[PDB]
Design a protein around this nucleic acid. Structure first.
Lengths: 86, 69, 95, 116
RNA sequence: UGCGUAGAGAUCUGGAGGAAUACCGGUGGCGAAGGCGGCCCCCUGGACGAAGACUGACGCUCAGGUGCGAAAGCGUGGGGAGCAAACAGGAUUAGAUACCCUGGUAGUCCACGCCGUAAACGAUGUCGACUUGGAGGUUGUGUCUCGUGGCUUCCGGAGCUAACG
């Protein structure tokens, strides 16, 4: 993931200016990495060690969403709708 | 002590990691590096010499450990 | 792109043909889009190991700046020549 | 009858039995000798004495070839190694130089049962 | 026993193939464990220090569940130099259906599938706080013959242990 590719995905999801670590921002980056990693699975079926990597990643995202939906259900439906998870 | 390794030698760059001829002088009966007491060098030189000896050893030029007489 | 060190060792028994393998060398570094900054030629020297059954080898040093995507394809063409014994493209600095 | 006049004296010293193989500057062995070639069975061959006889004979056989000087190249440890050397220092040849070309490997060879 | 003057052993040159990686190696290093050590490139995980910039306690453990998990042998296909259960003989012996010596199959090697165990042992799980220091080493920083942070060893205050530690 390129620098600008990361900085841009953080800005488009950033709640406000200078928003680096937020529920929607975090999950955004994780989702991205997950996508690239999942696509990395379509190929290299043998790469088992990487499978564990995404497991932790997706687990983190699952917990982040669980926290969000639990607190603000509105920000949740919005986040998912924008990304495309679930 | 008897004779400091530095005195019994001419001006040489401790950076040189290929000149085994001079490096071996800083080697005791074993591949161990001679202390400051014998080497005659100082903190600034000894530190460089050590590293120099390390690489020299990797180059297979200087033994890491030798057998006792 | 970035800096690279292309070491090229060849049969030191070569005659006037030495100044020709380098010709294909330059023709090889080129096209591959490699810009040579400096050039060093150690020439014939004693090898720590035989390789190609010959005790000696002709050394060369051509630090170049070319895309990291062609760096691999740059090697395949060099090794071809039966004269060249080996070719190791290093990153940059060398202790 | 090629009168080499000068060559090399390979000394394959071992705990089994030393074996000498004189040769020319090229490396072509002109003649050789061993404790076994001296008549020794197999247990007495390893003795340093059987090395002296093998060294002298291997030399004398070369004397016929006309060689006067040789370069000794010692290999592998074992009884009779230094014995074979001095044995060469004498005889009718002139030991011009001695060298310990004992291989003593680096890293990639599975040692035998005795060594493992 | 066996092999040998229709010629091996020993020696030089050339070719082929499989497997393993002789110094460095270490008393060392890495990984969750099993394990892992020539070099190059690509892909990828963990981790450490500095600046203190951002979120902000969203935590800890965890029945069941799910996943991972040496070796052995097993299934199918391939391979098989060397080694070698079973086993073929020669010796030793009172006897040897052992040790020793000569052969030798599965297996050992590769691909895919299987199992879930072990002195799977530091036989002493994770996190936080508190309690003398000395010495060696890896790594970052600093006013760097020393101070400070993280990691890896040894000796040890108090204390702990049945003893070892």
């Amino acid at each position: 993931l390129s620098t600008e590719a990361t900085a841009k995905i953080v800005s488009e999801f950033g709640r406000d200016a200078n928003d680096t670590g937020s529920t929607e921002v975090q999950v955004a980056l994780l989702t991205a990495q997950i996508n690239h990693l999942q696509g990395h699975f379509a190929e290299h079926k043998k790469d088992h060690h990487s499978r564990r990597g995404l497991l932790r990643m997706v687990s983190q995202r699952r917990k982040l969403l669980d926290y969000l939906k639990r607190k603000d259900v509105a920000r949740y439906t919005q986040l998912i709708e924008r990304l495309g998870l679930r | 002590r008897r004779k400091f390794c530095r005195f019994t030698a001419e001006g040489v760059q401790e950076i040189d990691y290929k000149d085994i001829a001079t490096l071996k002088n800083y080697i005791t009966e074993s591949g161990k590096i001679v202390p400051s007491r014998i080497t005659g060098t100082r903190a600034k030189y000894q530190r460089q010499l050590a590293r120099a000896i390390k690489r020299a050893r990797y180059l297979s030029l200087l033994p890491y450990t030798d057998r006792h007489q | 792109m970035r800096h690279y060190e292309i070491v090229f060792m060849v049969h030191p028994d070569q005659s006037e043909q030495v100044p020709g393998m380098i010709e294909r060398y330059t023709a090889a570094i080129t096209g591959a889009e490699g810009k040579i900054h400096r050039l060093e030629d150690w020439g014939r020297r004693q090898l720590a190991y035989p390789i190609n059954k010959l005790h000696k080898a002709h050394y060369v040093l051509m630090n170049v700046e070319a895309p990291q995507e062609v760096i691999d394809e740059l090697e395949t063409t060099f090794r071809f020549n039966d004269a060249v014994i080996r070719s190791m493209v290093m990153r940059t600095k060398h202790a | 009858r090629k009168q080499v006049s000068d060559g090399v004296a390979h000394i394959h010293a071992s705990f089994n039995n030393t074996i000498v193989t004189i040769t020319d500057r090229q490396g072509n062995a002109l003649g050789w000798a061993t404790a076994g070639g001296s008549g020794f069975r197999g247990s007495r061959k390893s003795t340093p004495f059987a090395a002296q006889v093998a060294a002298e004979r291997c030399a004398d056989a070369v004397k016929e070839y006309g060689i006067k000087n040789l370069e000794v190249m010692v290999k592998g440890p074992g009884p009779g190694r230094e014995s074979t050397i001095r044995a060469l220092n004498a005889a009718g040849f002139r030991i011009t130089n001695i060298t310990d070309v004992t291989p003593i490997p680096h890293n990639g060879c599975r040692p035998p049962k005795k060594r493992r």
